[PDB]
Design a protein around this ligand. Structure first.
Ligand SMILES: Nc1nc2c(ncn2[C@@H]2O[C@H](COP(=O)(O)OP(=O)(O)NP(=O)(O)O)[C@@H](O)[C@H]2O)c(=O)[nH]1
Ligand SMILES: [Mg+2]
Lengths: 173, 113
């Protein structure tokens, strides 16, 4: 059977979790905001020669119950910790998300990628590349800026996340 | 007070390989969701009943994609379950009531506390 890599979109409200997902799933992007409850997408893709399926869970950046949030997290295998480079508060918000992910998954090496979206709005930047790169290094994860609008690195983040998930599976089995 | 908000039949599917499992009946009440499953066995039709508190239940909208249509998923440790509604109308109704009674459950607790 085809391997299945479960990706979870994590990050504050409005950082562009949905935009990235939809851009990746259907090569589309709309400028208008659309609050997310919880959507599940699946797609057949080729990862280094093998046909696999990627499963993405796109949820609201704002969830009332911690128990529900944990049920979202616990179902994933890899995470895309998204924050917007045009809003510093969403960058600060990443530390808690990571802590919750670690607690819930109980593993320091959980497939995780730090993602700074909205790179096409360089003019409005609020978080510096270095700030982000530093946080990633101290968390021992990679950092990558994307733009779900222009597609810059959209495929890269999902495919790289898949590769780390595929690695942990390679060893942990 | 307590009351039956919504209920209906659904077909369960295994979430990872989307294989069809069995028919189930869901009963929505003001603070929990009851799912009744009837699994036939050689000499002992086994039954599985689960109650899911709405303040712990993660409801996910599964987007359509060929081997999948009109489905939504329930997430609650240690389970992940997918259910298919008879048509798009039924699926839409389930998602609306699950969302609305959860909202109602939250604001009901906000006034209290
Ligand atoms: N310029 C630009 N706008 C973006 C980008 N990504 C998202 N947006 C815009 O930012 C807004 C929020 O995006 P959205 O995908 O809904 O964010 P979210 O993280 O899913 N929000 P929620 O958690 O509330 O569902 C939308 O109006 C969207 O068009 C990007 O890379 N560049
Ligand atoms: Mg969204």
């Amino acid at each position: 059977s085809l391997a299945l890599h479960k990706v979870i979109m994590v990050g504050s409200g409005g950082v562009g979790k949905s935009a990235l997902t939809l851009q990746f799933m259907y090569d589309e992007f709309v400028e208008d905001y659309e609050p997310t409850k919880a959507d599940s997408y699946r797609k057949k893709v080729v990862l280094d020669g093998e046909e696999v399926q990627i499963d993405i869970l796109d949820t609201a950046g704002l969830e009332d119950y911690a128990a529900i949030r944990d049920n979202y997290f616990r179902s994933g295998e890899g995470f895309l910790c998204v924050f917007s480079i045009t809003e510093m508060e969403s960058f600060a918000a990443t530390a808690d998300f990571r802590e919750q992910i670690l607690r819930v998954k109980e593993d320091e090496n959980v497939p995780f990628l730090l993602v700074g979206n909205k790179s096409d709005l360089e003019d409005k930047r609020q978080v510096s590349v270095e700030e982000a790169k530093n946080r990633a290094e101290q968390w021992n994860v990679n950092y990558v800026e994307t733009s779900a609008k222009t597609r810059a690195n959209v495929d890269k983040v999902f495919f790289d996340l898949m590769r780390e998930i595929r690695a942990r599976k390679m060893e942990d089995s | 007070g307590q009351y039956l908000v919504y209920n209906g039949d659904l077909v369960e599917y295994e979430a990872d390989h989307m294989a069809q499992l069995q028919r189930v009946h869901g009963f929505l009440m003001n603070d929990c969701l009851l799912v009744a499953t009837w699994l036939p066995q050689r000499r002992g039709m086994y039954r599985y009943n689960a109650l899911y508190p709405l303040d712990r239940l993660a409801v996910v909208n599964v987007k359509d994609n060929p081997p999948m249509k009109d489905m939504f998923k329930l997430l609650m440790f240690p389970e992940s379950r997918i259910f298919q509604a008879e048509n798009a109308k039924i699926k839409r109704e389930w998602l609306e009531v699950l969302e609305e009674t959860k909202r109602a459950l939250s604001d009901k607790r906000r006034r209290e506390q």
